[PDB]
């Protein structure tokens, strides 16, 4: 079954191997050289069937024995190389490297590409299986890697090189040898890997890619990787170590979009301009301008959203106030409150006035002057309800803008003191949400004392815990951590059972967000609380720490906690946990959805009620039928808690979309539930969220490329969802103001282009669905609002933008090389 | 009761064998292990109705309700053609029985005792889609327009059902994809089923016709009934020309039954409410004009043979996974003005890979492609036109 030439070559090779086996000991070298010539000549050819390897496969053991029994010297290696190249085909006990090590060690390019690839794979295997010992044996397996990496670089196997280096765990030669054209491949490779790779390799890859970007001076990309890393130090370093001012301005846009604010000294080129940009003081004016484009500068009223005409006692007024505030958020003008809000507040009764007034700030978001002007009149009312609501309005107005002046600080520290009553929750929450990312020790030291004073009831204590935690989100601040630990220890053994204690562990975990061993230590310290609340706090802190890390083992632990029968606050928390861990990487999100479905199927009411919150968190402001129909199906569930949670999850997932087939579904739900007042309130809130900002804002805690996790937005979303974990008491009752925690996450969905003067540059752009790159062109003229999952690319080469992550505030360079 | 969708795992973006794909698959497997462990653990963790069951007939049967009478008596079909004037027990829900429902009857006395709402014909259940073909729109080269119309007909009316309302225009509830033998007609349905959130329903015209009496019309009734119970839904009828050819005066009984089933189908196409219908057809002239009447089949998408650009795109799509050799040039094969469907291009690629394997080389080449093109196509005199 072998051709004539095939059999002739087989005879030649058999004669040569017989000569090698024979103990001539005087003609081994010519035969070995002939074998090398034939084997490499066959291998270098594109044919995928090296005939010498096929023919010498059976004599592998005999060749090995001959090599073992032959005299040491040059011939030893001169045959070991052949033995290894032959063993490439047949293996099973990791012998190719074993024989190459004692080999000629010649250049790793004469042996085609497949030998290099097998070499890389097997050295990766060895490095993976080796322990901390045998460091002497790890030394030889580095020069071959140094030779391989440039080989792959030249031969377009950038992915193979990056892989091999990852498995080696020493990603140094990569950035040593990267070239100009290699970023578009290696940088994207590393960025994609980081999502699935676990720590500390996550940080290792992030820093490696950051160094790669710095090598050829990709400052915005290095800054994006720094932001990925939870450390506002490399961000300052990269911003400082820059020479161009336009790129610094764009980096300042993106930093302001992020929660980091850098307090530099008066040494940069334009300190005032850069700090103003990073503070986004002009954000209100830019939002108003974008409103003027595609004119939507017309506030709409709660009945307008409801559309009850086609197809006033206690709660519907509050719902109307909420939806009005949501729809007119940040647009300033309102047709029910701005015109005459005093009568509206007065017709509101009970605790409603708090939120009814805070809606004024929500409407006058990012507009300090307008907020002050429209809130001063209501700031002085006989009832402290209106005063506290006004304080919330001012806090909301200040939230989102990092003005160096602190009118919010002054006004609200004036009232931080209980003033002989517990109605300072408004002041505390306003201060928190206003200074979310500030992390000013001034506000920390203003808040921590009032938190424990023998008169701060659990309501105040929880509000201030949320506030301080979201002030120092993800920083592991010793003072805040210690004070919260002490208060948790000393609160009580019985009152902890009552609600509003859920927020102290939230403060802890949110301060220690994305940290790890820090929460391990804090848990070790916190193991002495009690039986019921200790597990709750442990799980909540754990999730608030590994939010977005995608730690499969941790979410497995949380799944076990969910599964164990409790006959269940911690069980409910663990659902939002699973959601929060999966809230990052895209691939795990759908599996988290499958887990949520299976939980809703085989779950007790306790976690059944939590599942909708998990759905909303996993798909916030990304309304897709896959989740919306499940939420609608379970909306009619018998459990009122489940129904309320599902409806609010629908509202959140539809937040800032104005989505049809969701507005209609909400209208039908309201029609069915007209007789249920609590459920009517919930559906009205869902409509308010759906029409939030009349389709100009998103609650997504992901801005850059759906990849950068925004600490402040995550803080707001998680605090709101934890508050709803028990909807009946916290929200369907006295403390309905907890809804306003959404400000930390609310963020406009815009795309505003600028020249190198902070001046708008109306230019046509193409927007469409990402392909991982653009499909379904829907080009318009900037500025253009972008829907979730839709990316924008310039329709023409007229410019030279400063970012490949074009979104939000983008500076455009009028420097095309050739037009 | 809402849609049914089709379970499908996420898509691993990298088609190459790389650590991105390996880690993505590892995470998928991790989550699958989590699901299995959660199940195992949960199902390990875990009088009046007895007399209700006792009163209910032991081997109770399933029949169909007809012309409910009184508040305690009704006419029910035994499911063998016969019907009875049966009574109703207080056990059943009541205020819930409607004609056509699949009620449960005591075996001996034949008295209504249950409602069994979820009664689905095994044929309908099996033709319902559970998996989801892994053919996203990205796999379709060319046919960009056709993709646009199909999305406007079955996708936009669900994702953004405000544009139609804004101008008071009803969505098209029927799209017939007509074309030569193989151009992507079934691919577009595959992609719609993959990417849509609606309950997909595969059917072939040659399946709806059963032998026993009126089971054909009854099965069409059941199919569209379930397509209504679930919503939104997309019913894909492939090779409808099995039933729907030019209606003609029957000379026999089987032909009369076939025409009756086709008429039953046309009747069920007047039950709006959001159940989209996608017909497929190789030869559209044979179809009756009644079906293609512009009130039941709103859109007709022609799937013409691919042009040079479309053929190029198809070739890159179907060779992306192939270790193409640098020597190859993908223009000569395309622009040779000969008929070439997308299926023909896939066959060309497969035969080229097989030719390279026969030559013992894993990398395809220009000569391999030429030989593949020569040996794949099966089927004007020379000089008469220049």
């Amino acid at each position: 079954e072998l051709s004539e030439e095939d059999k002739q070559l087989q005879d030649e090779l058999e004669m040569l191997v017989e000569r090698l086996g024979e103990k001539d000991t005087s003609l081994y070298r010519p035969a070995l050289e002939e074998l090398r010539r034939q084997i490499r000549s066959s291998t270098t050819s594109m044919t995928s069937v090296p005939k010498p390897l096929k023919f010498l496969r059976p004599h592998y053991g005999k060749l090995k024995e001959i090599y073992e029994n032959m005299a040491p010297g040059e011939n030893k290696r001169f045959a070991a190389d052949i033995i290894s190249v032959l063993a490439m085909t047949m293996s099973g006990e990791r012998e190719c490297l074993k024989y190459r090590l004692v080999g000629s060690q010649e250049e790793l390019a004469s042996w085609g590409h497949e030998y290099v690839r097998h070499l890389a794979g097997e050295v990766a295997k060895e490095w993976q299986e080796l322990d901390d010992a045998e460091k002497v044996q790890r030394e030889p397996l580095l020069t071959l890697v140094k030779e391989i990496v440039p080989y792959n670089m030249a031969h377009n196997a950038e992915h193979e090189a990056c892989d091999l280096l990852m498995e080696i765990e020493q990603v140094d030669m990569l950035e040593k040898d990267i070239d100009e054209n290699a970023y578009a491949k290696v940088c994207l490779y590393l960025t994609s890997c980081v999502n699935y790779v676990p720590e500390p390799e996550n940080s290792a890859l992030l820093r490696c890619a950051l160094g790669v970007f710095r090598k050829f001076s990709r400052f915005p990309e290095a800054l994006r990787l720094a932001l990925m890393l939870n450390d506002m130090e490399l961000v300052e370093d990269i911003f400082t170590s820059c020479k161009d001012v336009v790129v610094q301005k764009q980096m300042a846009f993106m930093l302001g979009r992020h929660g980091v604010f850098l307090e530099l000294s008066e040494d940069v080129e334009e300190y005032e301009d850069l700090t103003e940009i990073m503070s986004n003081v002009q954000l209100n004016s830019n939002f108003l301008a974008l409103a003027r484009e595609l004119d939507i500068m017309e506030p709409k009223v709660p009945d307008d959203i409801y559309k009850t005409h086609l197809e006033d006692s206690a709660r519907m007024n509050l719902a109307s106030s909420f939806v009005n505030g949501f729809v007119n958020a940040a647009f300033g003008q309102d047709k029910l409150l701005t015109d005459d809000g005093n009568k509206w507040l007065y017709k509101n009764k009970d605790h409603g006035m708090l939120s009814a007034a805070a809606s004024l700030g929500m409407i006058l978001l990012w507009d300090v002057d307008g907020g002050l002007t429209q809130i001063d009149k209501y700031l002085y009312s006989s009832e402290d309800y209106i005063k506290s609501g006004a304080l919330l309005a001012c806090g909301i107005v200040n939230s989102g803008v990092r003005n160096e002046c602190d009118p919010a600080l002054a006004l609200l520290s004036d009232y931080v003191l209980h003033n002989s009553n517990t109605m300072r929750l408004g002041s505390i929450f306003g201060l928190g949400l206003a200074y979310a990312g500030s992390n000013r020790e001034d506000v920390l030291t203003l808040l921590l004392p009032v938190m424990g004073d023998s008169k701060s009831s659990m309501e105040v204590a929880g509000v201030t815990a949320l506030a301080c935690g979201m002030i120092a989100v993800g920083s592991c601040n010793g003072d805040v951590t210690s004070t919260i630990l002490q208060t948790i220890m000393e609160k009580s053994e019985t009152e902890l059972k009552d609600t509003y204690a859920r927020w102290l562990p939230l403060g802890l975990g949110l301060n220690h967000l994305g940290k790890g061993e820090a929460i391990e230590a804090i848990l070790a310290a916190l193991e002495v609380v009690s039986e019921p609340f200790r597990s709750f706090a442990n799980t909540l802190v754990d999730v608030c720490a590994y939010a977005g890390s995608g730690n499969v083992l941790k979410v497995q632990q949380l799944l076990h906690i969910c599964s164990e029968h409790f006959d269940g606050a911690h069980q409910g928390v663990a659902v939002l946990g699973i959601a929060l861990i999966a809230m990052g990487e895209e691939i795990g999100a759908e599996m988290a959805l499958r887990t949520f479905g299976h939980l809703l199927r085989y779950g007790e009411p306790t976690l059944r009620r939590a599942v909708p919150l998990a759905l909303a968190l996993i798909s916030v402001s990304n309304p897709r039928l896959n989740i919306l129909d499940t939420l609608s199906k379970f909306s009619h569930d018998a459990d009122p808690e489940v129904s309320y949670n599902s409806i609010f999850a629908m509202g959140m997932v539809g937040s800032g979309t104005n989505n049809a087939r969701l507005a209609a579904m909400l209208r039908q739900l309201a029609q069915y539930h007209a007789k249920d007042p609590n459920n009517l309130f919930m559906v009205r809130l869902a409509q308010g969220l759906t029409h939030l900002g009349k389709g100009t804002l998103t609650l997504c805690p992901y801005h850059s490329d759906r990849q950068l996790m925004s600490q402040v937005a995550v803080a707001g979303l998680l605090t709101v969802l934890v508050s709803f974990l028990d909807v009946r008491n916290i929200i369907l009752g006295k403390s309905h103001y907890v809804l306003y925690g959404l400000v930390a996450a609310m963020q406009p969905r815009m795309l505003v282009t600028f020249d190198e003067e902070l001046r708008p540059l109306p230019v046509s752009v193409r927007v469409g669905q990402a392909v991982d790159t653009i499909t379904g062109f829907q080009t318009h003229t900037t500025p253009v609002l972008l829907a979730h999952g839709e990316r924008a690319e310039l329709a023409t080469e007229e410019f030279l933008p400063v970012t490949p992550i074009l979104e939000g505030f983008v500076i455009l360079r009028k420097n095309p090389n050739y037009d | 009761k809402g849609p049914d969708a089709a379970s499908k795992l996420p898509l691993v973006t990298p088609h190459t064998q790389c650590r991105l794909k390996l880690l993505k698959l590892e995470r998928i497997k991790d989550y699958l292990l989590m699901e299995e462990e959660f199940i195992r653990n949960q199902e390990q963790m875990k009088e009046e109705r007895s007399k209700v069951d006792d009163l209910r007939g032991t081997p109770m049967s399933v029949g169909t309700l007809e012309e409910i009478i009184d508040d305690n008596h009704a006419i029910v079909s035994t499911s063998v053609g016969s019907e009875h004037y049966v009574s109703i027990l207080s056990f059943v829900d009541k205020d819930l029985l409607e004609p056509g429902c699949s009620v449960l009857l005591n075996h001996k006395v034949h008295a209504v005792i249950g409602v069994l709402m979820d009664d689905t014909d095994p044929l309908v259940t099996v033709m319902k889609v559970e998996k989801a073909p892994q053919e996203t729109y990205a796999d379709i080269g060319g046919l960009d327009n056709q993709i646009q119309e199909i999305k406007e007909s079955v996708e936009l009316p669900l994702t953004h059902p405000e544009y139609y309302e804004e101008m008071g225009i009803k969505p098209p509830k029927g799209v017939i994809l007509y074309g030569p033998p193989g151009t992507g007609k079934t691919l577009l349905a595959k992609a719609v089923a993959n990417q849509t959130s609606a309950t997909f329903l595969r059917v072939v015209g040659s399946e709806l016709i059963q032998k026993y009496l009126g089971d054909g019309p009854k099965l069409v009734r059941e199919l569209f009934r379930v397509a209504e119970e679930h919503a939104p839904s997309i019913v894909f009828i492939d090779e409808i020309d099995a039933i729907g050819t030019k209606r003609y005066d029957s000379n026999s009984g089987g032909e009369r039954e076939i025409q009756r089933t086709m008429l039953e189908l046309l009747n069920q196409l007047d039950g709006f409410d959001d159940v989209k219908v996608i017909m497929a057809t190789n030869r559209i002239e044979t179809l009756d004009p009644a079906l293609i009447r512009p009130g039941r089949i709103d859109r007709k998408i022609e799937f013409p043979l691919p042009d040079e650009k479309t053929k190029k795109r198809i070739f890159q799509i179907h060779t992306s996974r192939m270790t193409l050799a640098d020597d190859v040039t993908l223009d000569d094969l395309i622009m040779a003005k000969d008929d070439l469907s997308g299926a023909d291009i896939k066959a060309i690629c497969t035969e080229a890979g097989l030719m390279a394997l026969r030559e013992r080389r894993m990398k395809v080449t220009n000569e391999d492609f030429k030989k593949s093109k020569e040996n794949v196509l099966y089927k004007t005199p020379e000089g008469l036109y220049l």
């Binding site: 496969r57 690839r117 | 590892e26």
Partner: peptide, 29 residues
Amino acid sequence: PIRALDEGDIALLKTYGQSTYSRQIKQVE
């Protein structure tokens, strides 16, 4: 001028040309 594949030929075709993680990838799938 057409040949028939051999067992060693096909074994070489399977092993020689493949990225090092092919077997693990197939196993996980």
